[PDB]
Every structure is written in C-alpha cells, then in structure tokens.
Design a binder for these strands. Sequence first.
RNA 1: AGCAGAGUGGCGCAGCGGAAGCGUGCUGGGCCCAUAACCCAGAGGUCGAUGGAUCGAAACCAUCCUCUGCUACCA
Lengths: 17, 422
Amino acid sequence: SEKEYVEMLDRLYSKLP
Amino acid sequence: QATINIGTIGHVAHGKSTVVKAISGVHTVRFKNELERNITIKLGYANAKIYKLDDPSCPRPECYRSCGSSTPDEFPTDIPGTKGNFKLVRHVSFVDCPGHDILMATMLNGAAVMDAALLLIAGNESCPQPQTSEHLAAIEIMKLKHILILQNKIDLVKESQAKEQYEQILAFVQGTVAEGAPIIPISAQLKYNIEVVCEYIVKKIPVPPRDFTSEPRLIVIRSFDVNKPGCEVDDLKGGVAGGSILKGVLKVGQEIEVRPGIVSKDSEGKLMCKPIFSKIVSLFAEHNDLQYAAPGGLIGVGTKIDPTLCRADRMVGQVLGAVGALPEIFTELEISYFLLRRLLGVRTEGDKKAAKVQKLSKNEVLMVNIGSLSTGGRVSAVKADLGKIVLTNPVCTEVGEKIALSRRVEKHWRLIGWGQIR
RNA sequence: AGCAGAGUGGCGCAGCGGAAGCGUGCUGGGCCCAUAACCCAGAGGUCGAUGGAUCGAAACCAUCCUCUGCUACCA
C-alpha cells in the first residue's frame, strides 16, 4: 500500500521542483 | 481481443485525458465535445494493446523512447526499452466509469461488468475524500477487488498535503479491501511512473477467471449506431450493442436478444414484455475483426437491432443474453438488503452528509442497480430485511450477484447501502 | 458527420440580366445670437471565394470560405 507510495515518492518528488 | 476490464475511476478535479491516454493511448469520447469541464462524467470506452520490451512499461508503437506530451515545462523522458518488433503480451480493455457525485448510478452500472479498477485520487480536495469512500466500498460489493490506488493530481500538491489524503481515505475504507491496493503517486503533469503503473495493471490485474464455455452474457452499457445521419437506402445495417461480456464467449452471427427488453402493447398491469432478438453482424477487437467475443472485455457487438434502438444510448444496463436466454425478466422484485450506517458518496470537511439515514418508507422510489442494470422503482412493502419493490420497466437480473440501493436524499439518489436478489 | 439559414457600404441590409440598394453612424455648410429640432452637401461597396454559362452577374448558377444549427455522437 504505502511502500508503493514511499518508493515512488523519492522517484517522483526528486523530479518535481 | 480483450481479456481484462480496468476501471479508470476517480473523483473531481484530477484530469482524465492525460492519465487514460498514458495507460491506453485511445481517448474516451462522446457528444458535448465541447469535451468536459473537470473530469469525464460519461461512461466511456477505452481499448489498447499493452505490451512490454522485457521492460514493464507500456511503450508507444514507436517503442524506442517514451517522450510524452503531458507538459511542456519538463520533458518527460522514460525509457520503455528500444525497437525490435515488440512481443504482444495481452490485450487490455478499459471501462471509464463516471467520477462525479451526481453520476454515482451510471458508475455502478459500468463497473458491474468490469474486472478491475483504478482509484484516481486528486490531491486538491479534502483529505477525508468522499468518493474514495464511495467507489471502493462499491467495488467491494460488485465481487471485485482488483484496485490500484492511483493518486493522480499531486503535481502542485506538495508531498505533505499528498501525505495526509491517502492515509485518511484508507482510514475510512478500513472495512473495504483497499489495503491490497497499492497507492501509487504519479504525475498528471510529468506523465510520470507510467512505466511503473502499467507494470501494476499487468501485475495487480491479471486475466480474471472468466467463463469462456458458458452462455454469452453480454450486458450492454453503451449503444452505438452505424446507421448515422447521412446514410442511404442500400446501406442498410443493424445497431451496434457494445458492452462488456461477463460470461460466455460470443460469436458472430449469433441471434442475441435484449432479455429485459421492452413493454409490450396494451399492458394494463405490469407483466408482459418481449426481448428484441437480433443476429450479431460483427465483433470488434480494439482495431481488428474477429469471429469470437472472448468475455471479460469491452467488446463491440454489432447486432441486427434497428437504427432507432441505437440512435441514443438506450441500452444502458440491459442483459443481452443469447436467443432463449435463461435469466428471468422482473418488473416486481423481492430484494434482501442491508443499509450502510454512513450515507456513502457524500462527505465534506465538516463530514456532511454521511450521517445515519432514516429507514425506507413504502411507496417511495429507490434506484436499484440489479446486476448491471439502471432502473428505478417504488417499494410496495418495506421491512428490515424484506423489500418488495415494483419496477417501471421489466428488468433482467443476469445473476443474483448484487444490487445497489440509493435513496433520494438530495438532487440525485445517494447510496444508503446495497443488497442481493432473493 | 448528414442537415437548415445568411454572407452586401462601418452597420442595418435592398435586390434579381439591360441595377451595388436604402436605414443608421459618419464630415462640412445651411438655419439661428446659438443650441435643440432640421435641410443641403461629404464619406461608407471584395453582393464570402471562384468565376463561368453570358450581350454584361451581385443576381443566374454551382463550388468552397465564414456565421447560424442538427441526429445529439454515429465501435
């Protein structure tokens, strides 16, 4: 549930300003 | 052709065009084009050929890179692989369910024939979001759990405001299967993680156990007319009855009826109706001809019904079983039901109006979503667990899977619970 | 998409082969000491395009362009 959040957190939010 | 049906289901102000084309590439379109104000309110179709390059992305038919067009601010560059005549894994089909609070009922009809769902969450509105409470518990009753929580609009929404919402929507669907649903933060602006999401719509969503050898149970939710204005005399055709088949493979040339059908002439009571029998002209596979309609997919079933029977979307929620179909045609209906203690489908930051609803009173109209059908009827004798409703139209239960009961507490009927057919 | 209407002076908008029309705006004079009210005079023409059948179309005649609308969506 949230492991797919926090992995894709650092993948998306490192590409977001 | 198609083996699965994934619902692209999501609440207001998250965008539908940039996310459905990211996973499919075929746009969901109907009239008023003049397209849509916020998010798609129609029950649209989407069909695609998902594949892989030994790489879990869904690449474009130019499969060297995946440079999307969801924004011009940053160039979205994912690597789906390279060229080399890709291997076709499967054929994916989508059922674009409506995601506004006003169109909850047609959402329940199109989702009752699908096999899978996506939960398209906006980070914009309130963190105890009502439709995430609405849709998922509705998915729980329609024998589906194939859910991918897809938090869609977090591009301007910061990582701490996005943090609060998926926690708090999961806190209220704690009595619903959404904990096996991964919560995927993506970009509706950078088209991001679609190489990870289209993995999950293969991973979390495989081919369901689908009855191939059974009788064809097409349930049309969308009507299509190939006898368009501008036709001629010697261009005589039928009407396309395009819905998802949940049971039984269907063939071209099959005499198919619409089993709930039409009221016959001079019905002084309620009990007389005839199904409209029709030979199937063609079967559609995403761009391609076939003679088979392998179920579990949104299949264009072109039938020999008349141009007026498809000039509008008049077959929303109709059991189109074959000629001599078994399931009965009910116009008065004995329902067993349970009433949910939260008025589901409406909840604001002040938690309105999800309080406990007054019980059903007799001679009051209530929307019943029987099988996948869209009909309204008044209850004749209402008990705690014994509802006797009479319908204005003779409707067919495809099977006694579920019903969704709603009570007119506002401008639209609002979900007070569910039930089953006795 | 098939469908119904118009295109014309800045606008309103006349018009059908022996015709680019008035109504308004528009400028100067007249009138008065002047205004108002008003008169005279000035200015405003791809008759959408294409043009042809033609003695000469704006018309006739078509086509496409624009606007107006439709089964309301047509796998």
